[PDB]
UniProtKB/Swiss-Prot annotation:
Protein's name according to its UniProt entry: PH-interacting protein
Gene behind the chain: PHIP
Coiled-coil blocks: none
Residues shown, of full length: 1315 to 1435 of 1821
Annotated source species: Homo sapiens
Disease cited in the entry: Chung-Jansen syndrome: An autosomal dominant disorder characterized by developmental delay, intellectual disability, autistic features, anxiety, hypotonia, obesity, and dysmorphic features.
Role description: Probable regulator of the insulin and insulin-like growth factor signaling pathways. Stimulates cell proliferation through regulation of cyclin transcription and has an anti-apoptotic activity through AKT1 phosphorylation and activation. Plays a role in the regulation of cell morphology and cytoskeletal organization.
Modified residues (Phosphothreonine): T47
């Protein structure tokens, strides 16, 4: 059961998403971009992603691992870097700060999960 629990990441990710939604820096990234308020968005971005979509995908049980969730979160930030490439932009700075916060906190979730996997595979 509790040591090396291969399902513990789910609640840990739910908690991290709660922290992210609290952050003022997540405001531009909470919901899908409105494709009529920004009609050139899809000209630039192939695969839109936002934190409400990540949170619903997790709730629906559609991530097989925390690495899958992490891929979608990283897409939020890589899409922002493509759409708002200027380091002058306060939106660029927001994305950088929130990315760094996410990467700090996801680190232990991933390493713990992979350790659990290695242990169960070995035994
Ligand atoms: N001002 C401003 C601005 N407004 C957008 C739209 C946006 C923002 C965040 C994520 C996705 C899309 O980019 C900018 N640089």
């Amino acid at each position: 059961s509790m040591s090396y629990d291969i399902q513990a990441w789910k609640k840990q990710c739910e908690e991290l998403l709660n922290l992210i939604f609290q952050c003022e820096d997540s405001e531009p990234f909470r919901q899908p971009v409105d494709l009529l308020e920004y009609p050139d968005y899809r000209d630039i971005i192939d695969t839109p992603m936002d934190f409400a979509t990540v949170r619903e995908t997790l709730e629906a049980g559609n991530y097989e691992s925390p690495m899958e969730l992490c891929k979608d979160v990283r897409l939020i930030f890589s899409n922002s870097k493509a759409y708002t490439p200027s380091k002058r932009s306060r939106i660029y700075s927001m994305s950088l700060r929130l990315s760094a916060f996410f990467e700090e906190h996801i680190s232990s979730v991933l390493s713990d999960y992979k350790s659990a996997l290695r242990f169960h595979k070995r035994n």
